[PDB]
Design a protein around this ligand. Sequence first.
Ligand SMILES: *[C@H](C)[C@H]1/C(=C/c2[nH]c(/C=C3N=C(/C=C4\NC(=O)C(CC)=C4C)C(C)=C\3CCC(=O)O)c(CCC(=O)O)c2C)NC(=O)[C@@H]1C
Ligand SMILES: *[C@H](C)[C@H]1/C(=C/c2[nH]c(/C=C3N=C(/C=C4\NC(=O)C(CC)=C4C)C(C)=C\3CCC(=O)O)c(CCC(=O)O)c2C)NC(=O)[C@@H]1C
Ligand SMILES: *[C@H](C)[C@H]1/C(=C/c2[nH]c(/C=C3N=C(/C=C4\NC(=O)C(CC)=C4C)C(C)=C\3CCC(=O)O)c(CCC(=O)O)c2C)NC(=O)[C@@H]1C
Ligand SMILES: *[C@H](C)[C@H]1/C(=C/c2[nH]c(/C=C3N=C(/C=C4\NC(=O)C(CC)=C4C)C(C)=C\3CCC(=O)O)c(CCC(=O)O)c2C)NC(=O)[C@@H]1C
Ligand SMILES: *[C@H](C)[C@H]1/C(=C/c2[nH]c(/C=C3N=C(/C=C4\NC(=O)C(CC)=C4C)C(C)=C\3CCC(=O)O)c(CCC(=O)O)c2C)NC(=O)[C@@H]1C
Ligand SMILES: *[C@H](C)[C@H]1/C(=C/c2[nH]c(/C=C3N=C(/C=C4\NC(=O)C(CC)=C4C)C(C)=C\3CCC(=O)O)c(CCC(=O)O)c2C)NC(=O)[C@@H]1C
Ligand SMILES: *[C@H](C)[C@H]1/C(=C/c2[nH]c(/C=C3N=C(/C=C4\NC(=O)C(CC)=C4C)C(C)=C\3CCC(=O)O)c(CCC(=O)O)c2C)NC(=O)[C@@H]1C
Ligand SMILES: *[C@H](C)[C@H]1/C(=C/c2[nH]c(/C=C3N=C(/C=C4\NC(=O)C(CC)=C4C)C(C)=C\3CCC(=O)O)c(CCC(=O)O)c2C)NC(=O)[C@@H]1C
Ligand SMILES: *[C@H](C)[C@H]1/C(=C/c2[nH]c(/C=C3N=C(/C=C4\NC(=O)C(CC)=C4C)C(C)=C\3CCC(=O)O)c(CCC(=O)O)c2C)NC(=O)[C@@H]1C
Ligand SMILES: *[C@H](C)[C@H]1/C(=C/c2[nH]c(/C=C3N=C(/C=C4\NC(=O)C(CC)=C4C)C(C)=C\3CCC(=O)O)c(CCC(=O)O)c2C)NC(=O)[C@@H]1C
Ligand SMILES: *[C@H](C)[C@H]1/C(=C/c2[nH]c(/C=C3N=C(/C=C4\NC(=O)C(CC)=C4C)C(C)=C\3CCC(=O)O)c(CCC(=O)O)c2C)NC(=O)[C@@H]1C
Ligand SMILES: *[C@H](C)[C@H]1/C(=C/c2[nH]c(/C=C3N=C(/C=C4\NC(=O)C(CC)=C4C)C(C)=C\3CCC(=O)O)c(CCC(=O)O)c2C)NC(=O)[C@@H]1C
Lengths: 273, 73, 162, 162, 162, 162, 172, 172, 172
Amino acid sequence: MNVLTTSSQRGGKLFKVTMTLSPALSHHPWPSLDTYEPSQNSYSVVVPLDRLLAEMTYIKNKGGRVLDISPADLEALGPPDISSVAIPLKVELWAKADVSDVQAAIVAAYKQIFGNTYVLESERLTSAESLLRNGSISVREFVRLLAKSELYKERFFFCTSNNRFTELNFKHFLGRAPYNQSEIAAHLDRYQTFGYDAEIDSYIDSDEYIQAFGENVVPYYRGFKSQSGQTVESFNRMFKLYRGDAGSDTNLNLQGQKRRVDPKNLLRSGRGI
Amino acid sequence: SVLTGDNQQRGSKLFKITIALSPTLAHHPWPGLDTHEPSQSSYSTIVSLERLLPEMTRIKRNGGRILEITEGE
Amino acid sequence: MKTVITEVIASADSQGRFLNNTELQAANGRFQRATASMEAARALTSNADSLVKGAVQEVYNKFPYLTQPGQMGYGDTNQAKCARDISHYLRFITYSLVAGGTGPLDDYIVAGLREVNRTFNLSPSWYIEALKHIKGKVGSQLSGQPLTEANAYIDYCINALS
Amino acid sequence: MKTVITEVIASADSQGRFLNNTELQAANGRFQRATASMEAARALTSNADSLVKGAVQEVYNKFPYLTQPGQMGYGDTNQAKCARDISHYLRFITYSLVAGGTGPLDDYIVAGLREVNRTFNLSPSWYIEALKHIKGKVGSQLSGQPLTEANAYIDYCINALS
Amino acid sequence: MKTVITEVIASADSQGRFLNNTELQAANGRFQRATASMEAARALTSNADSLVKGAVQEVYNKFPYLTQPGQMGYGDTNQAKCARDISHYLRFITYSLVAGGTGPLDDYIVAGLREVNRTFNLSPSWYIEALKHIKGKVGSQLSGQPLTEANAYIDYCINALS
Amino acid sequence: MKTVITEVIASADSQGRFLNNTELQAANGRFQRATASMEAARALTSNADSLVKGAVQEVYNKFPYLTQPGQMGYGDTNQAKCARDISHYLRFITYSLVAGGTGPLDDYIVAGLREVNRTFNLSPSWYIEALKHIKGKVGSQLSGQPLTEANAYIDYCINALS
Amino acid sequence: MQDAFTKAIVAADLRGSFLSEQELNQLTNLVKESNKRLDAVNAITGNAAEIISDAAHKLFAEQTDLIRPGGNAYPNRRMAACLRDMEIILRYVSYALLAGDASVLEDRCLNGLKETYVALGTPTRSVARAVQLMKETAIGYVNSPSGVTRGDCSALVNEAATYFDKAAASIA
Amino acid sequence: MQDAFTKAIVAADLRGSFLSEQELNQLTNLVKESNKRLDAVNAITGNAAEIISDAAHKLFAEQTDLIRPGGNAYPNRRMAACLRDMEIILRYVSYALLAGDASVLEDRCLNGLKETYVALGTPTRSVARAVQLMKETAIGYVNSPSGVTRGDCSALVNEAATYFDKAAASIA
Amino acid sequence: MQDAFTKAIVAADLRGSFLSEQELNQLTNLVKESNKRLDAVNAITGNAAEIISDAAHKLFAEQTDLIRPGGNAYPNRRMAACLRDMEIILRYVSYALLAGDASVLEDRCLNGLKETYVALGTPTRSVARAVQLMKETAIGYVNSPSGVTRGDCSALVNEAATYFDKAAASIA
Ligand SMILES: *[C@H](C)[C@H]1/C(=C/c2[nH]c(/C=C3N=C(/C=C4\NC(=O)C(CC)=C4C)C(C)=C\3CCC(=O)O)c(CCC(=O)O)c2C)NC(=O)[C@@H]1C
Ligand SMILES: *[C@H](C)[C@H]1/C(=C/c2[nH]c(/C=C3N=C(/C=C4\NC(=O)C(CC)=C4C)C(C)=C\3CCC(=O)O)c(CCC(=O)O)c2C)NC(=O)[C@@H]1C
Ligand SMILES: *[C@H](C)[C@H]1/C(=C/c2[nH]c(/C=C3N=C(/C=C4\NC(=O)C(CC)=C4C)C(C)=C\3CCC(=O)O)c(CCC(=O)O)c2C)NC(=O)[C@@H]1C
Ligand SMILES: *[C@H](C)[C@H]1/C(=C/c2[nH]c(/C=C3N=C(/C=C4\NC(=O)C(CC)=C4C)C(C)=C\3CCC(=O)O)c(CCC(=O)O)c2C)NC(=O)[C@@H]1C
Ligand SMILES: *[C@H](C)[C@H]1/C(=C/c2[nH]c(/C=C3N=C(/C=C4\NC(=O)C(CC)=C4C)C(C)=C\3CCC(=O)O)c(CCC(=O)O)c2C)NC(=O)[C@@H]1C
Ligand SMILES: *[C@H](C)[C@H]1/C(=C/c2[nH]c(/C=C3N=C(/C=C4\NC(=O)C(CC)=C4C)C(C)=C\3CCC(=O)O)c(CCC(=O)O)c2C)NC(=O)[C@@H]1C
Ligand SMILES: *[C@H](C)[C@H]1/C(=C/c2[nH]c(/C=C3N=C(/C=C4\NC(=O)C(CC)=C4C)C(C)=C\3CCC(=O)O)c(CCC(=O)O)c2C)NC(=O)[C@@H]1C
Ligand SMILES: *[C@H](C)[C@H]1/C(=C/c2[nH]c(/C=C3N=C(/C=C4\NC(=O)C(CC)=C4C)C(C)=C\3CCC(=O)O)c(CCC(=O)O)c2C)NC(=O)[C@@H]1C
Ligand SMILES: *[C@H](C)[C@H]1/C(=C/c2[nH]c(/C=C3N=C(/C=C4\NC(=O)C(CC)=C4C)C(C)=C\3CCC(=O)O)c(CCC(=O)O)c2C)NC(=O)[C@@H]1C
Ligand SMILES: *[C@H](C)[C@H]1/C(=C/c2[nH]c(/C=C3N=C(/C=C4\NC(=O)C(CC)=C4C)C(C)=C\3CCC(=O)O)c(CCC(=O)O)c2C)NC(=O)[C@@H]1C
Ligand SMILES: *[C@H](C)[C@H]1/C(=C/c2[nH]c(/C=C3N=C(/C=C4\NC(=O)C(CC)=C4C)C(C)=C\3CCC(=O)O)c(CCC(=O)O)c2C)NC(=O)[C@@H]1C
Ligand SMILES: *[C@H](C)[C@H]1/C(=C/c2[nH]c(/C=C3N=C(/C=C4\NC(=O)C(CC)=C4C)C(C)=C\3CCC(=O)O)c(CCC(=O)O)c2C)NC(=O)[C@@H]1C
């Protein structure tokens, strides 16, 4: 939830704490077995740093358990600005592209395909770049090569879960976020029989890819603007998948690869399987 | 597009495919009705056998038809 | 075709880098093992036939009804095929021992296995017995690492079949 | 981090398949080699210091002007750093021997090498000499495969630096 | 779930357009047919049991050895399962008649059919006989379009199984 | 090639839109500037040679050891090259002044700069001095905006080199 | 990624130090066991299909409802998933076993798994159960092979267990 | 892909036969050379950077015009490419050398190379030249190493040559 | 796509005219047959699996070599493809049959097929053969059903044939 003050009247960094409530922790003043209000299954409190230790011990000594702690300053921050992704920009690689134009595409591709994540000089792929700019490879095909590359696998696919990798994939290859639990299930099954290459192939091959930026257009962010057959919630999920500019998909950070989109949220948009 | 070297990293027999291009297959990111590129109304690509079936089926459903198939080597 | 050597090349190639010490170490592994592998192949190759007879046979004992008229096991054509097929499995196995990888097996036998078998109503079970019976016999002519290798590959198929 | 073991896992994992005989062969290779590798590391680790002194020194002989005032080689701080740095290179090399892969080298030393060096105006050349001088000394304390291994890794850096 | 009605909605929805005459025509088709379909379902639903008994039975006649000890057909648990399963097939078929589409079948039965069957070593063949035997019986209680419908769906499964 | 004029065309072209007031404003900016730029180029072009001599020279003063035998600065071939190279830098700079964009510089000089320099062991430092020395001389023949322009471009390279 | 060797390195790195002689001796001996280690892995991979098949049978005999209409393993499509999952978990476990380190398993396979099951309504407890059932069967093979030189595998066997258990726990 | 072993297999397959004992003996001995083979490769990879650097210097001393305005190696951008290419070719050659088979080299690398060069207006002749220059330098190392057991590498040396030459030819 | 109706339209359009009364009567008649038409299709789809299975058996009994090492249907992988292809062709044919027009079949399926087969080294003759084998079996069902109202389907039967034949021809 929103927190209204970053700091207590006495100086003290507030910290939002989220717990699963337990009947002992709060109960109705009613006859019969004590029940916590259902709406507050996940309770949140903002506590000053001083009372944080005591607060957390008490929660845990009852049947409570801590879902997560977060500094109030990071919380109660604006939802990321969509300014740059509201209109993506878009890059076209003409035939007979001069030297600079090819460079721009390359850069743009690395940006979108890898997230903000930085690609070092050694990481960068000369061979693939070589092919582009003497013809022979489509922008589309380059994009396939990047997702095949180990660089991609090491960041996105080898650290996190396949559940996470799918949506990670969706965002990079298609601006969209994933809609529905089915998409996640389909990709997982594809991966088990066909393997990693076939799964990567299935996003570029998909008509949604073809319909937008089909060939010789660097992929851009379709999500954040209204798309055909897109669940309304997907738009919200795009805010979870995409956090600000200068926010990346990073194996590097503590517990780097986690799920931006909770499984339950996916279930809301659609169920059936 | 003449292959400078085997485009694909993963290896199988490769086949060059020349297709007449529908605007849909390569729409330009332009306002109004999308136009495929004039310079190439006949994109030619190199494909691995495994990808060859998916590539052809996707080409088929889109307007454009296969002008010719040639083994890439 | 997937062998140790091809893979390291592939991996090296993807990242776009020279073969460094990492990969050579791996290669070395393949070559050291080969001596055992090769031995195993010589042994299977020689006893081939006898292994095949024994297997085919077994299958029939295991599934008597196959030999009854109107069944698959019945009438020589089918028996011939049955023989042929097992020969193949064996053949490939030897190949794989020598190539030092599952490669040969994957591409000949395994890929498309299911659908073939479905469309012609070959029951995996059968093949399996064949293999098992074989494995048992091989478990006499061989020993130590040579044996171990033979098994690995034989099994690999069992798992693919099942 | 790239070692033999991690790679085969990775490759297996990508394809979505169990570790089969192919990969184990490779692993085996890494383990057999280790005995030599490990030996080499014990040797470098022991003589570390002496190697470092010798190297740093060398560099100055090779590039006298560095020690003149207003240069990089001049004034103790810099010398200290110079020492430190080479120590590092060595340290990592040992690591890589033991880990049985370039991995440790790649991630600590190599990745970002260029830009660091550019921004602080460290000339690759220097490092290189250091290494070469080292290589020469190591070429006495070691022999046979142990030696060979040591070289491989040392070189790997030379090439990355250049 | 794929029924006529859901599909046209889907198609309309994808293009982003209102349901126009095109789709309604289609829908109309589904509704006209329903009368026959519904009839068929009432007939199967009533004779369910008897159909099931008959089928299970058949299978055993067709594959005597199943009932021998150490086989799959042997011992009540298995027989119970065998019954259960066929019941299901039937159940779904009725559903599909009423829903006016294969949908119900696809999502319950067909999706994942192969792998389940593989992992538990259920032979498609069996099921098939069951179905066929059924089809034959149904070919008495029904007639004309009602019949035709019943067949269609029954077959649809045969093909999926095989 | 990146100049003001080419870019606005490009941007217009991408969006698929006519050149509107926005872009022309930009163009107007360029061409207004040109008068100064052009002046600067006339000045560099004329004194070229003298600038080059002076620079090359400087470098040697700055790095005496280069002229010693067994070094890079030593023996005429190398000196010739050294001259040639700097000429180039200058040449391009003039071009860029006239073109009214960095374009010419980017494509000739900058792209691939690093790797070339690495593979042939040219130390960026050198070039830089050359440039600096130049900048200093130019800081006499020119004045006001003409000067300012000259600097901009000269620097642009310094930054690219470093 | 990580494994036994790499790990020890990393530790050493933060101290900023060459490897302790003591520490080498961990790795030295680790090498010696290799052969055993390998065979262990080989045993799992060789029997994979079976391990699962088996575990499943037992899982469904116990929790009848999973396979009853309205349960989580019904209908076929769901059942298939359940089997697939088991396999995956196993696959990873094996990987770990070779590496000599949980990490790979924790990051690729386990992390975030639990939450998925709950949101879907897949009952975490049952999943865990399955994992154990697998464990026991697997050990069965690891520990009772044919044509291997007879010796003591316990050390490896236990480590195997642990991996399975980390799995069970984090899912549960 | 292919390599020496796999190849022999494939041949055998089309005949439909088990491998001839004679044929095994090719492979048996091929194995025995491994160690030599490896060291050869190791030598190239170890010296890679240099090999190229060297070859280049010589290439440009000979064909001065390549580096003059209007030539193909000018300006920087182009030069860079030219270096990169040389290296690639080398990389592949090495790969082949390990495999014990031209294929990999032909299929990934050489195939289409000529045509590219042509379309660009790169002078194929000069490219070929470079490849040879490389060849000689490379052999230099293969044949004169340090810390290797003394023995005869000729067999390998020649095969190396051939690979280089296939390259030279198909480019040219 | 195209089909019988749409086609007639298009023709009419280029003339710039309303549909000819004569032309309507083609379509009017076409409608009358629909029920027959449908059943025909239904028959194929219902028997699909079998049609193929059957044809294949016969194909391989005749051309033994296809399944011998060195032949085109060997090994498994290839065999699989060959089966798959047959089926596809069938699938399309059915589509056409419903549409009342070859187009769909020609454009999606037949176009380019010959050349593909050629490049691969697939023997076009044999493919064609298979198609016929299929044809006969298929007609078999179309023409001999049970529980359908008895009447004359010939007209449809022949059109079916033609489709199969277009296939045979263009492949061959
Ligand atoms: C009974 C038909 C089914 C069932 C019920 C059940 N509920 C719980 C536990 C809780 N149920 C509630 C419900 C409410 N709390 C509220 O305040 C309100 C009204 C405002 C409701 C409706 C809550 C909050 C709990 C959890 C905490 C608590 O005990 O109050 C259980 C026990 C779960 C446990 O493990 O503790 C059960 C069994 N579940 C069944 O088995 C039936 C199908
Ligand atoms: C240097 C002053 C301090 C420092 C920095 C540091 N940053 C990272 C990693 C990243 N930092 C960023 C930064 C940005 N992303 C953007 O897009 C922008 C604006 C557009 C910025 C400024 C990002 C994206 C990353 C993550 C990706 C990546 O790391 O590759 C690190 C590396 C973290 C690691 O553990 O690897 C570091 C070190 N840290 C210091 O020590 C200084 C105090
Ligand atoms: C032996 C256990 C049983 C048996 C086997 C049998 N097989 C067939 C038919 C085929 N079997 C295969 C198998 C392969 N052919 C290959 O090329 C490969 C890869 C090297 C394999 C594994 C194939 C492809 C077929 C289909 C057609 C053909 O054989 O060319 C039959 C005939 C069944 C039929 O419907 O024609 C039989 C009987 N025979 C027995 O007696 C055992 C029960
Ligand atoms: C020795 C050949 C010369 C020398 C070295 C020297 N180095 C620096 C500064 C740095 N050295 C490094 C190198 C590394 N740091 C790392 O983290 C790693 C990986 C483990 C390496 C290889 C770094 C990063 C720096 C920059 C930051 C720092 O201060 O550590 C200097 C100082 C130059 C400066 O302006 O900072 C020097 C002098 N000293 C000599 O005299 C030789 C010529
Ligand atoms: C009858 C022809 C034979 C037979 C069948 C039999 N089936 C099983 C086990 C399963 N059968 C199915 C089938 C379905 N269950 C479903 O939920 C659906 C979709 C709605 C179908 C089609 C499934 C899923 C199972 C596996 C789970 C389970 O335990 O039931 C068995 C038992 C297998 C075992 O190894 O224990 C049997 C025996 N029994 C006979 O007598 C015939 C040979
Ligand atoms: C002058 C400060 C030093 C010097 C220079 C020098 N350069 C080379 C070799 C090259 N220099 C360049 C530079 C360019 N060539 C271009 O086309 C461009 C872009 C337009 C530039 C900037 C290149 C490409 C080379 C490589 C080979 C060549 O000369 O063309 C050398 C020779 C070094 C060698 O061994 O290869 C030298 C010496 N000479 C001096 O005296 C200073 C130290
Ligand atoms: C079987 C032991 C038990 C079971 C499993 C089960 N799982 C699903 C569905 C999914 N399972 C996953 C899990 C994973 N994603 C990953 O990336 C990994 C490895 C890190 C796993 C293991 C996912 C993402 C799904 C959803 C998508 C899909 O189905 O492919 C089901 C189906 C339930 C549903 O409603 O989708 C089942 C049944 N549940 C049981 O009943 C067993 C006890
Ligand atoms: C432990 C669960 C079981 C066991 C194992 C065991 N193995 C050995 C020795 C070896 N096992 C292998 C196996 C491999 N080495 C490899 O390189 C590969 C990959 C291709 C494999 C599969 C080898 C080669 C050896 C050495 C020779 C031999 O087989 O004996 C031992 C001996 C003791 C030791 O290695 O330290 C043991 C004990 N024994 C058990 O008790 C279980 C059956
Ligand atoms: C260097 C010895 C000579 C030289 C090389 C040179 N090459 C290019 C451009 C390219 N060369 C290649 C090379 C490859 N394509 C492949 O598929 C492979 C094998 C897998 C290789 C090695 C390619 C792709 C290109 C075109 C695009 C690119 O970025 O390289 C150039 C530049 C040509 C231009 O006009 O831009 C050059 C200079 N040319 C010489 O001067 C030497 C004789
Ligand atoms: C040939 C160009 C030169 C040469 C080679 C040579 N090598 C050996 C023997 C070995 N070489 C190696 C090297 C490796 N084996 C590996 O597993 C790896 C990768 C990690 C390497 C680099 C090994 C282990 C051996 C065996 C022991 C040894 O070093 O002697 C020989 C000896 C004959 C043989 O075939 O074993 C020779 C001749 N020696 C020359 O003089 C050539 C210039
Ligand atoms: C079987 C009756 C005969 C046969 C078939 C066969 N085909 C292939 C390979 C391919 N066949 C096709 C066919 C199609 N691709 C399409 O797009 C369509 C429908 C739109 C068809 C009909 C294609 C494209 C391939 C190659 C790629 C792929 O398999 O997807 C083979 C194997 C050839 C190979 O070397 O891999 C075979 C065997 N050939 C015979 O032997 C039979 C007489
Ligand atoms: C022709 C190959 C064989 C044949 C066909 C035949 N069918 C009918 C009549 C009908 N057949 C159908 C079938 C359908 N209508 C639908 O809407 C659907 C899809 C859900 C089907 C499958 C229907 C409804 C009719 C009309 C009523 C009826 O069947 O009694 C005839 C009768 C003539 C007519 O045009 O109505 C015929 C001849 N009968 C054969 O024996 C041929 C071999």
